């Protein structure tokens, strides 16, 4: 059993995670196509992590006797340049983190503490493994220079 | 070492029988794999490899006796539509093989030709223990477990 | 068939020209100190020679005479961007020839050589992608940064 | 590069198909694990990963053709309320995908795009053998075995 | 995935060709072993195993297409008296197999089913390189080395 | 375990035959080593050791049946002059040994002495496969390879 | 510049030798002569490594290697013909290499000279191998030589 509000919040977060997975997929493939291999490996690992997070969320929704809507997918912001991709990923992650904070508050209110623990784990991942790394990447594109950052992202020839 | 015409003829009959058996087990194993009965498929593939070894032994014996192995001839095939039908068809073919092998062993003993008799006795041993025993056990297990439980056992991992 | 053998000989000539061009470009990349780009060009050369080995064996197995005498015009670049551009252009010509030859081999119902040429075309398209990406990386990250990456370890 | 508009569009269609399949098998594997059917959930999850890899290959090819990978669109999922319905829906989706794949292969041959055709042939082989065959054999097993026996086999170790 | 009746018939013709090839290779290998040509017996026995694998792949494809695979049909064998005659017969039958394979591949291209075309192209590659090429090489070797020297090489270690 | 005196007599005849075979094979192996034919030397030395093993089997059986072995008596040695004559002589002696063995096996069957029949069938198999088969193969290889090529193979490394 | 031109001519011959040796090895493997085909494959590979060294040497001299040109390929229809064609090409190699080494010694250029001297050592070794192969063909008969060149069946 699981409350309606909690299940709806979980479904919202799941839609978010699936959209982010698709975006990370697209961006990793474009980054590999462009020749940036380090950035591509990072983004692919991130997409795999997103898939794992979505898996955890779906398992949670199914345990709570709900219906995980995977048919839906939010608006997808694709980048044309590497800085654009980085900024778009960061924006998506920020929105996701906001929604996650809201969902954690809702799960606390509805006294669903296991779900809240899962969501807290997800928020930790989305704040450290993702948002931090992308903010760092934007800062490095600013400080290293676009050319130097793209050289670093290309890895080895 | 010239071979007697009768021993050559009975060896050729047994060779035709074993080659027809090899084809039958090959078809049965392949459609069992098609149906997902992987355990039965693996066992029947092993049995068809043993049948190939039997045909090889028979051909070696025929060639040693300066005979011409009639390998182009193939007996009638009985192909089942479901697992019990394959088990019954294989059992019937194996009883026919046992009868023919027993007659050939009798002829080999009557005709002084003892090495072929030993080869055929080995073939009869493997036929009744590896094949006929397994198929009789299989029919009994289909009867006792029931069709559904037996088919679950045959399917194995899904 | 005569037309299939002639097309195979043409593809073999393209491959031999590519072998010579790639090995020369690798050697001058190593001469300039571009160790990593030189190693990649050397590997690309070796793969083209393995492809030419496969094509020669195919021509012989078709009871034909391989023409290792002919060679196309070697486009030799004065600098690394020109090397990459020349390699890409030669791959363009080779890919067009490969597509036409695969169509011809399909028409004559000669499928083993068609499959071998499909393998060749897959590798050629991968090489297209690599060289186009290298040129785009040059444009994106600057010639100096690309040359530093090509050097790798000093 | 400079892929044909028709080829790129067909590839995008195949991609939408692959992504929808990925989502569907994801959902199905999760609720199969939820129901306790672990020996089936593992297979479904492996197939979902395979789908992910296939879609990756497709996107890489579309990008190599200077096209825009439509990873946004998604078809209408068909989620089963029971394992038989699950497997039937999976089989149906895979059959539709195979039809679309055959059409795309024909288009790639007609437009002399042989590398994309090779990729699509690989995908079609994987979908016909690794997926469609398994789903068909599962639908047959959950009928030869009975629903109860099949679900016992699908649950694996309790 | 139901297949075309024409594709099933052509695959059955290919299957009977491969079974006949395996049978003829069996007889030839065993005769070579009887004469003491050890290395030739090894090679021809391995070719027989490859032909059994080819027949298995063909029958799996036929069963996958829901067509009954005919293995009772066997084509007329061409057994050679001596080694050059045997290898000439093997080369001729392999050429006929190649022609039938090319016709089947063209049919599979026409009938829009491409997994069968893939397996048949694999079979054609194996027939052309693993079997046809070795046989023409050996015929040329009989011509060049001479019969006595070629048989000395084929006998190997006495 | 005193047996039938006729069984002891035929066992003594067989033991004398094996001892003479061992003597002839010893002389032939040493002659082949003397002429420089190392491959044939090794094979014939192993065959001489096998004849010694068969003599051991026969003498153990004779002593078990409370019989006095006839080891002093020997048959005439058919010693060859060149390699083809030596091989033909070995083959002829082995064929005669096979005939004697078949007669003894028949006598052992007639006297209900089944363990001696078992050892005699073992000896007959080793004589008809490890000895007679190889000797007829060698004669055929002399005919096919020619004498010069066969002797080159026999000499081996020089 | 004369040393560079001589090195380019040596490189052209070495490229022709690569092509001829490889095509001969592939033909020998097509006919079933596995031992001879393997030896000729190894010889082609050694000549590829030699051409690699000579291209390195030419580029070190700030010259432009001429990989476009190629000498005539003497392609044989049967094994003895390809043996003698290899031998004749190697004889031309030896004459050209000796002239090149004398030129390099005259021009006070010594590193390309020791490279050409080792090249001449392998070339003379190959010349001996092919002359010995022809004499062996004559000695044992073409049938026996082809049986040996086949190796294992
Ligand atoms: C024309 C100038 C050529 C040069 C400078 C050259 C150079 C080389 C080098 C340095 C190697 C490395 C061998 C090793 O390290 O073991 C090699 C190997 C090889 N070459 Fe050449 N080569 C040339 C032409 C060719 C041609 C025309 C062919 C075939 C048509 C060919 C076929 C091969 C093959 C098959 C290998 C072995 C590849 C391997 O072992 O991975 N080469 N070559
Ligand atoms: Fe059997
Ligand atoms: Fe930098
Ligand atoms: Fe049960
Ligand atoms: Fe075959
Ligand atoms: Fe004995
Ligand atoms: Fe010889």
* H, E, C per residue of chain A: CCCHHHHHHHHHHHHHHHHHHHHHHHHHHHHHHHCCHHHHHHHHHHHHHHHHHHHHHHHHHHHCCCCCCCCCCCCCCCCCCHHHHHHHHHHHHHHHHHHHHHHHHHHHHCCCHHHHHHHHHHHHHHHHHHHHHHHHHHHHHHHCCHHHHHHHHHCCC
**E99 touching chain C per CB within 8 A:** no
| List of chains touching F (3+ CB pairs within 8 A) | B, E
Chains that touch G (3 or more CB pairs under 8 A): C, E
DSSP category for residue E65: T
Which residues in chain B are closer than 8 Å to E72, comparing Cβ atoms? Answer: 23, 74, 76-77
CA Rg value for chain G:
17
Structure tokens given for F154: 């026999």
- Nearest alpha carbon to residue D107 among D16, D15, D21, D4: D4
| D89–B contact, CB cutoff 8 A | no
Measured over all CA atoms, what is the biggest interatomic distance in chain C, rounded to whole angstroms? 53
CA distance A85 to B23: 61
Is E39 an interface residue toward G (CB < 8 Å)?
A: yes
- Helix %, strand %, coil % of chain E (to 5): 80, 0, 20
Distance (Å) from the C-alpha of residue C129 to the closest C-alpha of chain D? 7
User: Would an 8 Å CB–CB cutoff place E129 in contact with chain C?
Assistant: yes
Q: Which of A40, B19, A100 is nearest to E30 (CA)?
A: B19
Rounded-to-integer distance, Cα C118 and Cα C101, Å: 10
Residues with their C more than 2.5 Å from the N of the next written residue in chain E, i.e. before a break, are none
Q: First-to-last CA distance in chain A?
A: 55
C-alpha A65/C-alpha A79 separation (Å) is 38
Q: How many helices (H) and strands (E) are present in chain A, helices listed first? A: 6, 0
Residues 6+ apart with CB under 8 A from F137: E34, E35, E36, E158
Is residue G115 within 8 A of residue G61, CB to CB? The reply is no
Q: What is the resolution of this structure in A?
A: 2.9
For atom 28 of ligand 1, the residue with the nearest CA is C49
- Which residues contact residue B73 at a Cβ distance below 8 angstroms, ignoring those fewer than 6 apart? B16
Evaluate whether E23 touches E77 at the Cβ level (below 8 Å): yes
3-class DSSP state for residue F80?
A: coil
Please check whether residue E51 is in contact with residue E18, taking contact to mean a CB–CB distance below 8 angstroms. yes
Among chain C residues, the shortest Cα distance to E127 is held by C112
CA C55 – CA G145 distance, rounded (Å): 29
- Element (DSSP H or E) covering residue C109: none
- Do F129 and F78 meet the contact criterion of CB atoms below 8 Å apart? no
Report helix, strand or coil for F112: coil
Neighbours of C115 (CB within 10 A): 18
Ligand 7 centre to CA of E152 (Å) is: 7
Q: Which of G66, G77, G79, G82 minimizes the C-alpha distance to G10? A: G66
B19 touches chain E (CB under 8 A): yes
Task: Give Cα D111 distance to the centre of its chain.
Answer: 25
Contacting residues for A8 by C-beta, under 8 A, at least 6 apart: none
Pairwise CA distance, residues F83 & F98, whole Å: 22
Q: Sign of torsion, CA D114 D116 D118 D120?
A: negative
Question: Where do runs of H (alpha helix) occur along chain D?
Answer: 5-34, 38-64, 83-110, 114-126, 133-144, 147-155
Residues 114 to 143 of G: which have CB under 8 A from any E CB? 143
Closest of A102, A92, A83, A58 to residue A146, by C-alpha: A83
- DSSP of B43-88: HHHHHHHHHHHHHHHHHHHHHHTT-----S--------SSHHHHHH
Inter-residue contact G6 to G113 (CB < 8 Å): no
Q: Identify the residue among B55, B74, B80 best suited for mutation to test binding to E, counting E beta carbons within 10 A and taking the highest.
A: B74
Do C128 and D112 make contact, defined as CB atoms within 8 angstroms?
no
From E148, E149, E158, residue closest to F154, measured CB to CB: E158
CA dihedral (D120, D126, D128, D132) positive or negative:
negative
Cβ-contact A87, A138 below 8 angstroms:
yes
Contact yes or no for C152 and A157 at CB 8 A: yes
Residues with C-beta less than 6 Å from any ligand 1 atom: C 16, 19-20, 23, 46, 49-50, 52-53, 56; G 15, 18-19, 22, 45, 48-49, 51-52
Q: How many Cβ atoms are within 10 Å of F57's Cβ, its own excluded?
A: 18
**CB-based contact, E30 to chain B, within 8 Å:** yes
Closest ligand 1 atom to residue G23 Cα is 30
Measured CA to CA, the distance from residue E85 to residue E80 in angstroms comes to: 5
Block residue for tokens 């002891």:
F8
Judge: E138–G32 Cβ closer than 8 Å, yes or no.
yes
Distance F140 CA to ligand 7 centre (A): 17
- CA-atom Rg of chain E in angstroms: 17
Nearest atom in ligand 1 to C23's CA: 5
Best residue among C39, C46, C48 to mutate for probing ligand 1's pocket (most ligand atoms within 8 Å of CB) is: C46
3-state secondary structure A13-47: HHHHHHHHHHHHHHHHHHHHHHCCHHHHHHHHHHH
Residue D86 has which token pair?
């699950």
Spatial separation of the C-alpha atoms in residues E31 and E27, rounded to whole Å: 6
Paired tokens of B24: 């039958």
Between chains, do E128 and C61 touch, taking CB under 8 Å as contact?
Answer: yes
B/e letters for F84-113, b = 16+ CB within 10 Å, e = fewer, are bebbbbbbebbbebbebbbebbbbbeebeb
Look at the alpha carbons of D130, D132, D135, D139 in this order and tell me if their dihedral is positive or negative. Answer: negative
Contact E138 G150 (CB under 8 A): no
Tokens of B65: 């006796």
* Region class of B36: left (phi > 0), else alpha (psi between -120 and 50), else beta: left
C-alpha angle B134-B73-E29 in degrees, rounded to nearest 5: 85
Q: Are the C-beta atoms of D123 and D58 separated by less than 8 Å?
A: yes
Closest partner residue to B35 among D137, D146, D150, by Cβ? Answer: D137
Buried b (16+ CB within 10 A) or exposed e, B27-59: bbbbbbbbbbbbebbebbbebbebbbebbbbbb
Question: How many Å from the N-terminal Cα to the C-terminal Cα in chain F?
Answer: 54
From residue B18, alpha-carbon distances to F61, F66, G30 in Å are 38, 45, 39
> What is the C-alpha separation between B9 and B103, in angstroms, rounded?
12
Give CA–CA dist B146/B152, Å, rounded. Answer: 10
Centre of ligand 7 to C-alpha F26, Å, is 29
Nearest CA in chain A to C151: A157
Closest to B61 (Cα-Cα) out of B101, B103, B7, B20: B7
Residue with tokens 């040693």: B64
**Side-chain half-sphere CA neighbours of E76 within 13 A:** 3
Helix or strand or coil: residue C1?
coil
Asked if D141 has any chain B CB less than 8 Å from its own CB, the reply is yes
Residue D92: other Cβ atoms inside 10 A: 12
Chain D nearest-CA distance from C36, in A, is 24
CA atoms of A67 and C10, how far apart (whole Å): 61
Residues E103 and G8: their CA atoms lie apart, in Å, by 52
Q: Which of E95, E102, E103, E127 to mutate to test the interface with C (most CBs of C within 10 A)?
A: E102
What 3-state class would DSSP assign to G120?
Answer: helix
Number of other CB atoms surrounding residue B2 within 10 Å: 8
* H/E element, E77: none
What was the elucidation method? Answer: cryo-EM
Angle between the N-to-C axes of helices B5-35 and D133-144, in degrees from 0 to 180, rounded to the nearest 10: 100
Q: Which residues, 6+ apart, have CB-to-CB distance to B66 below 8 Å?
A: B1, B2, B3
Q: Mapping DSSP to helix (H, G, I), strand (E, B) and coil, where does residue D37 land?
A: coil
């Amino acid at each position: 059993x699981x409350x309606x509000x909690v299940x709806x919040x979980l479904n919202x977060x799941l839609x978010x995670x699936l959209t982010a997975x698709x975006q990370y997929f697209x961006h990793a493939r474009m980054x590999x196509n462009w020749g940036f291999x380090x950035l591509x490996x990072x983004x692919x690992x991130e997409x795999x992590x997103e898939x794992x997070x979505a898996x955890x969320l779906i398992x949670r929704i199914l345990x709570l006797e709900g219906x995980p809507x995977x048919x839906x997918x939010x608006x997808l912001x694709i980048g044309x340049x590497v800085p654009x991709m980085x900024x778009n990923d960061x924006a998506x992650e920020x929105x996701x983190x906001x929604x996650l904070x809201x969902x954690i508050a809702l799960c606390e209110x509805x006294x669903d503490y296991x779900x809240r623990x899962x969501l807290x784990x997800x928020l930790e991942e989305x704040e450290x493994x993702x948002x931090x790394x992308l903010x760092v990447x934007x800062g490095x594109x600013d400080x290293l220079x676009x050319k130097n950052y793209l050289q670093s992202x290309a890895x080895x020839x | 070492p010239r071979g007697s015409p009768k021993v050559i003829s009975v060896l050729n009959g047994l060779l035709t029988g074993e080659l027809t058996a090899a084809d039958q087990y090959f078809v049965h194993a392949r459609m069992l794999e098609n149906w997902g009965f992987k355990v039965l498929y693996e066992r029947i593939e092993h049995e068809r490899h043993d049948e190939l070894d039997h045909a090889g032994l028979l051909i070696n014996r025929i060639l040693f006796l300066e005979g011409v192995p009639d390998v182009a001839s193939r007996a009638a095939l009985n192909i089942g539509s479901d697992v019990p039908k394959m088990m019954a068809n294989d059992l019937a073919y194996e009883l026919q093989v046992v009868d023919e092998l027993k007659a050939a062993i009798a002829l080999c003993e009557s005709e002084r030709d003892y090495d072929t008799r030993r080869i055929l006795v080995h073939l009869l041993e493997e036929t009744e223990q590896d094949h006929v025993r397994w198929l009789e056990v299989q029919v009994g297990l289909i009867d006792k477990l029931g069709l559904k439980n037996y088919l679950q056992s045959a399917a194995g991992e899904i | 068939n005569r037309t299939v053998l002639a097309a195979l000989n043409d593809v073999l000539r393209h491959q031999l020209t590519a072998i010579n061009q790639y090995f020369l470009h690798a050697r001058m990349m190593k001469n300039w100190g571009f160790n990593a780009l030189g190693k990649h060009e050397y590997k690309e050369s070796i793969e083209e020679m393995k492809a030419a080995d496969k094509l020669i064996e195919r021509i012989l197995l078709l009871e034909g005479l391989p023409n290792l005498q002919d060679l196309g015009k070697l486009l030799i670049g004065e600098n690394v961007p020109e090397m990459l551009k020349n390699d890409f252009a030669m791959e363009k010509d080779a890919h067009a020839d490969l597509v036409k030859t695969i169509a011809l081999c399909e028409k004559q119902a000669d499928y083993v050589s068609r499959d071998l040429l499909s393998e060749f075309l897959e590798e050629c398209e991968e090489r297209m992608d690599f060289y186009e990406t290298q040129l785009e990386l040059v444009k994106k990250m600057g010639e100096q940064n690309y040359l530093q990456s090509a050097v790798g370890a000093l």
